Amino acid sequence: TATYLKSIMLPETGPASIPDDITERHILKQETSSYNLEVSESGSGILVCFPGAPGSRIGAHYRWNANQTGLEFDQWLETSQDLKKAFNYGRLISRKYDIQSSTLPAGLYALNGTLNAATFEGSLSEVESLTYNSLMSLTTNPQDKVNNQLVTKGVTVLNLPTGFDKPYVRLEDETPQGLQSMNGAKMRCTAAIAPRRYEIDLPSQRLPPVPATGTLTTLYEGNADIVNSTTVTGDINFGLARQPADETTFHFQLDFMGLDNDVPVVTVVSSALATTDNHRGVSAKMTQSIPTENITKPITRVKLSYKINQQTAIDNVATLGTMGPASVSFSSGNGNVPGVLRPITLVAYEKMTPLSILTVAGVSNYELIPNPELLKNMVTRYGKYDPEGLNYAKMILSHREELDIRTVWRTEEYKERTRVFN
Amino acid sequence: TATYLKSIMLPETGPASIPDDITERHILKQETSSYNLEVSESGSGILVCFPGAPGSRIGAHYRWNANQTGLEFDQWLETSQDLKKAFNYGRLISRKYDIQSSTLPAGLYALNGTLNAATFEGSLSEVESLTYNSLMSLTTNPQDKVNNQLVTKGVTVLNLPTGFDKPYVRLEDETPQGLQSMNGAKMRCTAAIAPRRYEIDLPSQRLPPVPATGTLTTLYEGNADIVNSTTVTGDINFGLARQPADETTFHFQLDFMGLDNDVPVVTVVSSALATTDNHRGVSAKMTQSIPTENITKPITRVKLSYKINQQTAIDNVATLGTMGPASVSFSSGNGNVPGVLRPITLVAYEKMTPLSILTVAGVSNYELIPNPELLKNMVTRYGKYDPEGLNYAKMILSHREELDIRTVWRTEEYKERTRVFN
Amino acid sequence: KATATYLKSIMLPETGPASIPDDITERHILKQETSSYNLEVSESGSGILVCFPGAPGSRIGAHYRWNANQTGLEFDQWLETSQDLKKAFNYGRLISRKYDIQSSTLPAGLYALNGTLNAATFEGSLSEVESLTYNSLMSLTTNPQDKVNNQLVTKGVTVLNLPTGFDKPYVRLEDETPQGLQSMNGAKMRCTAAIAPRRYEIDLPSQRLPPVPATGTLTTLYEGNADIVNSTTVTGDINFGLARQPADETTFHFQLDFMGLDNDVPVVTVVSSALATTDNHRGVSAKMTQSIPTENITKPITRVKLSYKINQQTAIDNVATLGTMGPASVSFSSGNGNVPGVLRPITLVAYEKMTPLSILTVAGVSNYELIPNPELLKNMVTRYGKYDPEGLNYAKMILSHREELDIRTVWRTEEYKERTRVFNEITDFS
Amino acid sequence: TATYLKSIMLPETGPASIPDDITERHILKQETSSYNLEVSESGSGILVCFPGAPGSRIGAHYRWNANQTGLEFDQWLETSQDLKKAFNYGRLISRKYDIQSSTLPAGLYALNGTLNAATFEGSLSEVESLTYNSLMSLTTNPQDKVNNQLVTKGVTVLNLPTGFDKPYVRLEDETPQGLQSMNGAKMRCTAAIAPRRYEIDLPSQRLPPVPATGTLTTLYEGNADIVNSTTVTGDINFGLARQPADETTFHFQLDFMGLDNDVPVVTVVSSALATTDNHRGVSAKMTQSIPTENITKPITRVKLSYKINQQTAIDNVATLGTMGPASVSFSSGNGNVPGVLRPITLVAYEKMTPLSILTVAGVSNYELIPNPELLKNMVTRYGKYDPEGLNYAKMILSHREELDIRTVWRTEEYKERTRVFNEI
């Protein structure tokens, strides 16, 4: 008994079936991650942990440039194997990170570098400043924060479950295909189980005047965050004042960006054509679908903008909404599943010794469902019937202030404070 | 212990956390709502209650016209605070309404009025007639109806949970927008979790003829309820019979109306064009996205139309369904979340004294999740760990008939039968 | 008690004044000034009473009434004292205040009248209220001692004033100064209130000005919420550089009109002009050096709208980016608005659905310690306080224990009337 | 009782409400800072502290260039949370910094660095020489200095109050704005309570001749310090000696700088067309308003310059004061509030190995008044009513010298010498 709470508290002692009502025929599997990140020239950076995200991507790694004016995206933090090549559905029992430098000092003093870590029950886009200083100002729970820990003593980022009846989620696997496919066109059973919808929702005023032809004047830019395949559904209707002398195109842009620099991860264009016939209602439909492989890095910003090609019609005010709401939306995968996009843990290091080694070390315990190619050889069973295992975890989570269990640790307060679940 | 049932029966005794499986870090907040409703000169009107809606709108009010020929929308019933300005996610614990008049104007001797209240497991597009005598047939459950109740004694509308593992729902809040937006564009993380889709499915026969140019003849009209943002998908495709002599437009309409009058709440237009080339493959696509702020009143009817702009094209039958099924879909928000749009509680008052006042006092109990601005200055924790208490609140929901645990009460029998729950 | 004389003036402001026993010790004059209003309820049967509890002065509140169809409000009148203080005095603090709002129609039969009354104390400035609505003002505070909802309009509500701070300064009262016989006809200098101002800055960004639709059509630049209640000075400038030198002389009006919270006709507007010419087309500064007397502030100001317009039909494509000759902003500082009590905190009393043509009575009372003007300074003796050492210290523990003692800024007038007798009103016989 | 002096003495033990006369409903909130400053190649620098500033900017950091001829602004130091976004008014209760190195870079096996510190009472622009060993000659109070302290042991800076009835200060936050705002404009409720005003007072003699057209001659250069929103008022009025053959503009600058390097932090402009009619009464109005996001780094200098745009106008002497005193004033925020702009505490470091880390750890305590959105959900209340409260705190400040209560400590002395104050 109580072999599921022990797997939450100690995620490296192996997986265990979530003893809840969503009982399927699954596979218990533990997957690890091992990185040796080379500290950049400014010795500073931030690594975003998604501790409850069921999948292969468990984190991202950004690093400050020399002047610490901006960040650069180093790489994702995946697991050992890409789970979608042998599994179609998956959950997450447990996860644990060990962010800790591996540079043993010879002398009696430590090398220079510290760690701030905060569990922010929001999303990456909702953070206003990503900086080692302004991380304590993301929560107020004393169990979600750790400040000024030596980088050679390390922080353990536990994952405390956010809900207990989470659904098995598609892993973006690939379907069989024929031999007459194009060359590299594939098809995926992507994630769509509880989407996260956004909507730019422009008002019914005139379009801003563009300074020149083909200059891409901005219409809106906000903070929406995206991790996997999205569908863009909307339209941008507008009526011109006077019928155009020539015919104008009205290019619309909608590019997506990251939190580090203004080079668009994905851009998605729609076009119109203002003609003498339809000069009173023109519509540019956004019906584009964005696969999950074009998202090379996390997305935290969108920007909608437009440009016109005709030299004239630069004074053709073109009021919006002449055929309806004039709104553009997009929906994304499993954004609104507890664990994806929310919550997140931020671990930031400052002034680590230039060209030294930070070693992240992750452990995940999944509940997976093999793909048909693997059912031939893998036996799939049910949960092991723990009747009390979830009440015990609910009791542990409800008293996390007296017992001082926490999402983020000091790795030595952790290594010492959890040997009672053995 | 047994403190979650107390918050169901006595929504005024404050909120208690749901002991179900979804365990988050939340905020227990109570909201009140108090309205003094002017009664029209007819005296009749009708209230709509959404006793399970987790949002910030808890009902609507319609007032019959001078001779009960039609209704008119009065206003939305909502809570005191606008939850979507300080919170992101939320789910409802319990709610309670209290109706009465019990007061009359300066010099008057006659106080007359009666109440019919019945809980309906439909969605208010399902109701056929909202008249005072009608809505006693909306259910055949004994403990869901109250008829011929004196307006001075009033009805208390309770809320019984239709399910327990409800998900937290995005409250349609604005996202942090950068500069360079145009003037008033704004993006909201709308609701997507468990939507409600309506397929139109026009049959692939001849398009009915227009009597004249630009007169908007009907293609379909029906009942479908929408309260939050929605996205419209599909396309009407059709091939002309011979060939267009000159270019025609085929302007499609798709208006949305409420139950009171026939002025559309919001209209989404899509305009095709039949040229000589595509004269057998004309297609009018629907991609519009309706923000949840264009829904001013409860939408209950949908009507699709079309019209042409050329005289020569009254003939040229223009058969549907050449390129595909020629259908039109639209999905909305949390339509299929149990609590939104289901169930409804109708409360009909009948011939109150003209120019008298009806009193609606509601108290909701939510479990909210703050927004990043509020996370820094507010502690968010887990539930109180009632191990039982869900079973204790589910035994009552099953023995409700031998316990007479009602959804609609007479205020005087409620105010004394529920004192057993401390 | 020998002590508890100052506290007795806060809890029972009807029983006359009592000098504030703080460190601001001047030779002053104790005065009690009363307010009385019988308000004619309008056909909407609804309205709002914006109280100003800690406001030292004559104006102690405002009365707004909803229009017929309950869409927007209308400004009835200022709620002030019976006699004008600034005629006889020069300086003043406020010791305590109390408002009593009540329906004086009082039905004859067995059923009460249809009128209900909401009241909440908001630690804001009447521009920080997103919406004034009978339902909307029950979530303005979580403090249970600042909220009363669903009070029957005949039983009434009491709005007690609790001091926020104790070393408040003596503020000038906008008395007008002596003048020679050569003034034109209506000029008058006033010693206006300027001690601890509240400042706003509109802060335009340094980029292209929005395009104007036509000539003289007043394009909007900014509109937000900034409450002003007395005299103010506008200080700023707007500068811009034209794309290319103009074909003619463009004027570029700027409007900056202040607006109340009820209708969009400006309470006061003030215009500046910058004539862009051939030579100085690269920098065109519109100086904003304005001073609005409190005599122009007719009703409470809650919103602002900065707008502009050009007069040449040409030059309508001269994009005119801002910020050339510096930050390109405009500012206006108003009176003594950061003095605690002025503009914050305020109390809102909403009456909803009363009988039209019924009567709503309002009976204020305000104890001041004032300083006479020279005219009656030759007849009144001004002296120091009463020397109660523990007077302030006794009131400090009352405010700190106001939860367990249940000391409220908003009452039901039957729990106020019955719960304020421990503060002596009982005449212990000799 | 005695629970407020404990907060002044040991700020790390949490905030406590001030027992003074300013009694308003408020929120007690403790905010931390954490900084790892990078020592440059000169191994030197200076770390300014604003121990009593109720805002969010609690200090700047400077470095000395290679040959120590001048400084360079590195960065502001500031609380983790941006207070203005969730609060309108605030008062500071306590604030303690903490400075050390205690660690070493890659290829180093010996650490070295010494550390001067002194509690000034001017305003960061009244100091004349700001070198490592000159800031010892800025005070004579033994309780306000520490000399040649090893950087590995550390200097603690403590905030002893200067006054007790400080008002709640506006935190410069946003106001609600409706639609129709142009693109990115924004109105803020800035600080104005107790301003600080300078005036440049030019004499009514002739303007100094300009060398060439458009060459920016200098009229005044001096030391004034600004940290927030500033209004400029005044005018320069002059009369040309004779008829101007061609109209001149007379560009007047008045730009502001920091102490690091003479690049303008904020520059302003005013022009005065001298035409043939008003050549007896030309005047250049100055009516600008400088918001607080333009003050990117501390300002400690102003320069008022001018220039002409015509060739013939280099003669025609243009004497000042023809229509009045001809001065240019500017009043800034709430400079004269005790705690803002004074007292300053400077901590200088030198002889440190380049690329080593200088750790700063601040912890502040505030009384804050939540903004309307946060006000709807959090409850505000009054002080905790300690009647004596201040007399105990006021007693220690008077017995400062015999009890040795310092603003600038050395850490090992601070850690143990102040354990006395652990009692509730």
Numbering used by the authors:
A (entry chain E), B (entry chain D): 7 to 428
C (entry chain C): 5 to 434
D (entry chain B): 7 to 430
Task: Show me the paper's own sentences about this structure.
The first infectious IPNV capsid structure was determined at a resolution of 2.75 Å using cryo-EM single particle analysis with imposed icosahedral symmetry. From another perspective, five subunits (a) form a pentagonal unit at the 5-fold axis, while the remaining subunits contribute to hexagonal units in the capsid. While the overall structure of the VP2 subunits is similar, notable structural variations are observed in the C-terminal region of the B domain (residues 429–435) and the variable loop region of the S domain (residues 110–117) (5-fold, down, and up conformations). A comparison between the cryo-EM structures of the infectious T=13 IBDV and IPNV particles similarly reveals differences in these surface loops, reinforcing earlier observations made from the T=1 structures. Both IPNV and IBDV form four corresponding surface loops: L1 (IPNV: 206–222, IBDV: 204–222), L2 (IPNV: 245–260, IBDV: 245–260), L3 (IPNV: 277–287, IBDV: 277–284), and L4 (IPNV: 313–323, IBDV: 313–322), while an additional loop, L4′ (326-334), is unique to IPNV. However, the variable loop of the other 12 VP2 subunits in the asymmetric unit adopts either an up or down conformation, contributing to the formation of the necessary structural interfaces within the hexagonal capsomers in the T=13 capsid lattice. The Tyr115 residues of the three up conformations largely contribute to forming the interface. Specifically, this intensity was observed from Glu429 to Ser435 in subunit (a), Glu429 to Ile430 in subunit (b), and Glu429 to Ser434 in subunit (c). The C-terminal extensions create an additional hydrophobic interface and interlock with neighboring subunits on the capsid interior.
The infectious pancreatic necrosis virus (IPNV), a member of the Aquabirnavirus, can infect diverse salmonid species, leading to lethal outcomes characterized by pancreatic necrosis and catarrhal enteritis. Birnaviruses have a bi-segmented dsRNA genome. On the contrary, VP2s assemble into a 60–70 nm T=13 icosahedral single-layer capsid to protect the RNPs. The VP2 subunits are organized into three domains: the α-helix-rich N and C-terminal base (B) domain located on the capsid interior; the conserved β-barrel jelly roll fold shell (S) domain; and the unique β-barrel jelly roll fold projection (P) domain, which is situated on the capsid exterior.
